[PDB]
Amino acid sequence: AQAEIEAERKRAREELRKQVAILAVAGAEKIIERSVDEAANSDIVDKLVAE
Amino acid sequence: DLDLAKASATDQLKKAKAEAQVIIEQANKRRSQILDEAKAEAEQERTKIVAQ
């Protein structure tokens, strides 16, 4: 019985973590979309063209 | 009376053995009862613990 309760605790913890993962990464997406500058895009491209 | 003693010895043996068999089947039954009681107690214990 305690093993089955532990399995359900695992389930609930993972579900909560996955919801916060989705929303956190979506917020990161919107941040990166709004907060950007050419002096940063050129830096990213200059890191890419290095290899 | 010698052959009657023969029959008496054999009848006594078989009577004692059939008398032991009822003791044994009794133990088997008690066992079947007490293990059912234990299983039911365990089941109700699980129900309450999981509901908690």
- DSSP for chain A reads -HHHHHHHHHHHHHHHHHHHHHHHHHHHHHHHHHS--HHHHHHHHHHHTT-
Which residue out of A5, A8, A9 would a mutagenesis test of the B interface target, given it has the greatest number of B Cβ atoms within 10 Å? A5
A37 Rama class: left (phi>0) / alpha (psi -120 to 50) / beta: beta
Question: Please, which experimental method was used?
Answer: cryo-EM
In angstroms, the separation between the Cα of residue B29 and the nearest Cα of chain A is: 29
Half-sphere exposure of A31 (CA within 13 A, CB side): 6
Residue written as tokens 């009862």? B33
Residue A1 with chain B: CB contacts under 8 Å: 45-46, 49-50
Q: Which residues of B19-52 are buried (b: 16+ CB within 10 A; e: fewer)?
A: eeeeeeeeeeeeeeeeeeeeeeeeeeeeeeeeee
